[PDB]
Design a binder for these strands. Sequence first.
RNA 1: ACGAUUAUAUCC
RNA 2: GGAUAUAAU
Length: 620
Amino acid sequence: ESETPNLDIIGKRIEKIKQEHETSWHYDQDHPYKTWAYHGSYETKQTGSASSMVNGVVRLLTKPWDIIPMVTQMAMTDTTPFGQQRVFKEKVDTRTQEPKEGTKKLMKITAEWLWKELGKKKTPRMCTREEFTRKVRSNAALGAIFTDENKWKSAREAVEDSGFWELVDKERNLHLEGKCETCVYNMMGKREKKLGEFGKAKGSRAIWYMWLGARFLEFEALGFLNEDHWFSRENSLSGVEGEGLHKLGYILRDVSKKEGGAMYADDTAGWDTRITLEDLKNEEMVTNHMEGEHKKLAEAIFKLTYQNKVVRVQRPTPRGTVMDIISRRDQRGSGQVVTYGLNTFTNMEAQLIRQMEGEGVFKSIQHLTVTEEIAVKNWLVRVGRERLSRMAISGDDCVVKPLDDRFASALTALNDMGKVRKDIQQWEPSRGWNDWTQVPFCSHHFHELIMKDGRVLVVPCRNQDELIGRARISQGAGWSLRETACLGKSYAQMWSLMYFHRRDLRLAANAICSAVPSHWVPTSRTTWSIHATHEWMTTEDMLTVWNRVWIQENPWMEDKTPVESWEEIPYLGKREDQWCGSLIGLTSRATWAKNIQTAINQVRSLIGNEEYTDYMPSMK
RNA sequence: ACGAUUAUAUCC
RNA sequence: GGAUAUAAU
Ligand SMILES: [Zn+2]
Ligand SMILES: [Zn+2]
């Protein structure tokens, strides 16, 4: 299970790091790395956090959930080097057994077919520095590894300096030689909100980012997959790139119209970690569709920086905090320019193969019969593009409506490819949904909503406890009321646009809007401006948003007749609202709703003497 | 100091 | 077009 570094590929980098840190370079033999080649360590200062901050306005306005642990245990993640290392031991420090011969044959035939179909109406191309210069956020991370690279205070200042692009040229000229001297990953813990356990916040995932020079070189050679929308639903059939979250239910309802079995949406456990060097090499086949200088640069990124990664990660130790130089050949580095696009690719390929195994196209990994190989190639030819349309795929999240239900029990290939399902035994047959409105996708399910007009909407919907929990906490420490009042309204605005159809969220949302100064306009998470005459985001121009998104711009809404009142906008049926976590019918909820003006007036008085508006007469 | 890819709102 | 905020992979 040990990792075999190629020191002819990653060797010059590890050395350059060493040289810049000679006063501290040691070789800890207490290093915990069981499946990653460890190369050294040196001293460094801890970054990260594990605190969470209370949004007082929302917590005061959501009292019935105080008693609900699925709300109240929500916290920010632990991104300290402790939190990272736990995540590392649990998820990133693992090995996937190389797939069997049959599997590798299935994967290559399917990868090669896929790129030819993705390339029928697109052509790979280099991206431009001007293109990079316009896209990059101005405060995106510099991520400098070497001292030659730590000259700028922002990415904007950097891409407007000749000396930045001189560095980029030095590595660019190496890449065209087949060598790499400077592309090293940084590491951090994903800052997000997770349910805690036993009074401890938990880390979530790893985030790997190279420096801004390297990130351009990625973008130069592979950005075209994103910039030219290769994984659009139009181009790839299976993808859903570019569609927002509210529109995804419409994409699912269509998929459901196909004749087939149940609808399956099995999560893969730690997808990025389970990406194998075979995967990494099937993904590289896109270079077969490239040319000239472009082909060399794309090969350089793939072999020297994706299939040969030098990662630089923090580990707590008794003698302060240290920084390990570790290296892995396989795995997707979360934060590579190709993360979203190439997870969609490989997942498309995976599910297809799983579709094939259910249909009988091949009977066993380890061995692909000369005859069977012909049947696979002819199955893609015959039905492959249709099989792709039976799927909705967003990176590793996927929904597959297969031909029959033998899909559920077709798992030899999926497991051998390393794509182990989460929360189910390796060979436990799969759970499948016969009602598309209950299929999870991009952390939601989707309800068909009949309007008072008779028109139908499809709307996103999740367990309420999940949404209230997240509105009630925030980045930071301690408690806050004024500093996160506009943040509460932001959440309220989201509840009214996406989840207007949950009684509790629309009530809570009008409450938060009523309790927050109406003339305050957010300038950051914790700062704002005050306009003397204008209110911000009134219940009327909230309704303008609801129309603009759900009627005017909704391509599944042929009748563009607006709604004139918030009372026109319907709700889910009570039993469904209840099923999806609503508190109606509980006694705590009734009291909360009756005395809601009393709690609004508390928050008002706690905030101070500002200007307020009642958003509640939208529900009478 | 603050990844890539993306949707939406808002402010300019 | 940018920034801010939220959300998704
Ligand atoms: Zn390089
Ligand atoms: Zn629901």
